[PDB]
Amino acid sequence: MTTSKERHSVSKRLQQELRTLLMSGDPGITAFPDGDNLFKWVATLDGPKDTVYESLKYKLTLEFPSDYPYKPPVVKFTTPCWHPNVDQSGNICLDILKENWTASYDVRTILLSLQSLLGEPNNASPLNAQAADMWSNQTEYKKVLHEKYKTAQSDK
Amino acid sequence: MTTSKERHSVSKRLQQELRTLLMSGDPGITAFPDGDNLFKWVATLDGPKDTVYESLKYKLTLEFPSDYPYKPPVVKFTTPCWHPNVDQSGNICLDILKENWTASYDVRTILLSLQSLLGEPNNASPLNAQAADMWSNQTEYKKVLHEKYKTAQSDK
């Protein structure tokens, strides 16, 4: 029991990240613990401006492992996301969420990066071949995208 | 469409209150929107120190009406609270939550005030006559309080 300078705990890191996030005020991005659970957040992301995803809103979940921040959280879309790098279950293919993860990244980085990925997909090895293929026609893509988005809301 | 100085909206007020709360860092107090709902928060309050409620933890919900902050939120205990000013349903009898409400109060005030009410009840007109009556014997009160608290966790 000497001093107290420089410490750590997952709950502590999550609090600091939740502060920097809320204080930063990035447009179209919101994130808060599921409620009383600090290890499970529910986030909201507005589609990036000047892209076919503009005006669209997506809900996600971020589940923080016992190793955070030395291990990436599990980020999934709860709102169906028709995108080249997203599957039907909502799982995402994002570099920073896998081999590129560094504990120097925060939740803000993940959400800002993901928001931008919507308008900047990586059609190399797609989780959604139909979206990857249709990306070359932005007029038809916007049509299909908004159809499914509206239909997902109407149906269950 | 002239300027933009000095504005309002419930969602805006709630955001500023959620910031001041998280930034303040009051010990034993936590509060965040139910998730994606900003009009319904789930809070956590640790029993005040140097009282029979020390070491006890309570979960609550705060439901913000369409008139906030000119109308008080509905604060209820989700974790059963054996207290003179609290009923079996979790409803609370707190001055600032009724006739004493002022839009100049925030969620931090409510939670700090309520946390202190645990060790400072108003036995005048009790919602729980059994707790109000037993308050005069702090030894027996602490015994009953902790029994029920532990039993509520075990049972449903």
From Swiss-Prot, chains A, B:
Pathway: Protein modification; protein ubiquitination. Residues 9-154 form the UBC core domain. Its EC number is 2.3.2.23, 2.3.2.24. It is an enzyme of class 2 (transferase). Catalyzes the covalent attachment of ubiquitin to other proteins. Acts as an essential factor of the anaphase promoting complex/cyclosome (APC/C), a cell cycle-regulated ubiquitin ligase that is essential for the transition from metaphase to anaphase in mitosis. Involved in both degradation of proteins responsible for maintaining sister chromatid cohesion at the onset of anaphase and of mitotic cyclins A and B at the exit of mitosis. Acts by initiating polyubiquitin chains on APC/C substrates, leading to the degradation of APC/C substrates by the proteasome and promoting mitotic exit. The active site is at 93 (glycyl thioester intermediate). Belongs to the ubiquitin-conjugating enzyme family. This is Ubiquitin-conjugating enzyme E2 C. Signal peptide: none annotated. PROSITE patterns: UBC_1 (PS00183), UBC_2 (PS50127). It comes from the Eukaryota. Keywords: ATP-binding, Cell cycle, Cell division, Mitosis, Nucleotide-binding, Transferase, Ubl conjugation, Ubl conjugation pathway. Component of the APC/C complex.
